[PDB]
Design a binder for this molecule. Structure first.
Ligand SMILES: O=c1ccn([C@H]2C[C@H](O)[C@@H](COP(=O)(O)NP(=O)(O)OP(=O)(O)O)O2)c(=O)[nH]1
Ligand SMILES: [Cl-]
Ligand SMILES: [Cl-]
Ligand SMILES: [Cl-]
Ligand SMILES: [Cl-]
Ligand SMILES: [Mg+2]
Ligand code: NA
Ligand code: NA
Length: 326
DNA sequence: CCGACAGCGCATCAGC
DNA sequence: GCTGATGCGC
DNA sequence: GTCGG
């Protein structure tokens, strides 16, 4: 946190652009600016010293100069005072409600937690669960809790079928001391890029996790992706753990390294890496890395046997998960 | 300038 | 019912 | 909002 103030300001700017102006590129520019300034190993002394970083342009440079001078940003003062903005911004904190739905509620005059609660009949399922656990979802997960959750998830998966491999990814895999949610990569040998020799693969696991009351709620669910709610069991007389977001992603087993690379993140590191891929003439997704032909179209999956081969293809030295926290 | 800016699964709706 | 577009999240 | 060509 050499520049906690600056990166905070840009995050806020990013959030405003995304949630209020629905200007998704401004949002990503601000987020890239914050990321790169966050790993910059010096206390920034000026807008111009910042301009030197890539992703920091002129507009962001003046803003940073303004911030270093006054301790703030007037553009943000105004935004904070603007009732309709703060309301829309607030509503997009409920899982399942984004910039559009938030703006639509605020039009109807639904602009607070109280308002949301008494208009529940107006929410889709996801939004309704998001609201249920609003408070809990605001809380981070200490890694110590993640270790307990991991041990539950992996042991219950092994119980359904010892063939499953479940790998906790996301910020946990990058060694963070706390995580927003839990992201779990799932593989079984019956599901490859060549075939689905068994159905319900994800269902079974979800079912087993619900049966032991680990999974309490479902936000959305398909054949290969689950997003719902879970809870550590508490002890006698013991106060309950908060409810936690959980993602479970079933990926073809012969496509694990591309899968674990994707799910390990961070989201900004994934973006940078994939952008660099395109520059090298490749496209990377959670399944494969493919070459782009002159025409532009993606070719056939290159052979991959380690996270590192993907790094090799695009001429990046390997970065351990802990160093992918952008 | 000016186009590109990562990639995609699931829920919901429109239009048929 | 379907596909295609959009919203929302990982 | 920023950047590469
Ligand atoms: O826009 C996204 C979002 C997520 N992802 C990936 C990478 C990421 O680490 C993973 C899990 O997504 P999260 O939303 O859980 N972010 P993360 O786990 O890295 O941080 P945290 O959970 O601690 O808030 O899925 C993307 O590639 N693009
Ligand atoms: Cl934009
Ligand atoms: Cl400010
Ligand atoms: Cl792979
Ligand atoms: Cl693919
Ligand atoms: Mg996570
Ligand atoms: Na720059
Ligand atoms: Na939200």
């Amino acid at each position: 946190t050499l520049n906690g103030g600056i990166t905070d300001m840009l995050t806020e700017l990013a959030n405003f652009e995304k949630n209020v102006s629905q200007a998704i590129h401004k949002y990503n520019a601000y987020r890239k600016a914050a990321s790169v300034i966050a790993k910059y190993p010096h206390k920034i002394k000026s807008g111009a010293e910042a301009k030197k970083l890539p992703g920091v342009g002129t507009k962001i440079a003046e803003k940073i100069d303004e911030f270093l001078a006054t301790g703030k940003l007037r553009k943000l003062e105004k935004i904070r005072q603007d009732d309709t903005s703060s309301s829309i911004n607030f509503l997009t904190r409920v899982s399942g409600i984004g910039p559009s739905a938030a703006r639509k509620f605020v039009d109807e005059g639904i602009k607070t937690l109280e308002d949301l609660r008494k208009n529940e009949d107006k929410l889709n399922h996801h939004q309704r669960i998001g609201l249920k656990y609003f408070g809990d979802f605001e809380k981070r997960i200490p890694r110590e809790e993640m270790l307990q959750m991991q041990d539950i998830v992996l042991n219950e998966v092994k119980k359904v079928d010892s063939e499953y491999i479940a790998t906790v990814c996301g910020s946990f895999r990058r060694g963070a001391e706390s995580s927003g949610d839990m992201d779990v990569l799932l593989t079984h040998p019956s599901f490859t890029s060549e075939s689905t020799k068994q159905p319900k693969l994800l269902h079974q696991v979800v079912e087993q996790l619900q049966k032991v009351h680990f999974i309490t709620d479902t936000l959305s669910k398909g054949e290969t992706k689950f997003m719902g709610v879970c809870q550590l069991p508490s002890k006698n007389d013991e106060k309950e753990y908060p409810h936690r977001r959980i993602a479970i992603r079933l990926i073809p087993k012969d496509q694990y390294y591309c899968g674990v690379l994707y799910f390990t993140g961070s989201d900004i590191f994934n973006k940078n890496m994939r952008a660099h891929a395109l520059e090298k003439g490749f496209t990377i997704n959670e399944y494969t890395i493919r070459p782009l032909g002159v025409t532009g179209v993606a070719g056939e999956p290159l052979p991959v046997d380690s996270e590192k081969d993907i790094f090799d293809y695009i001429q990046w030295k390997y970065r351990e998960p802990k160093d992918r926290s952008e």
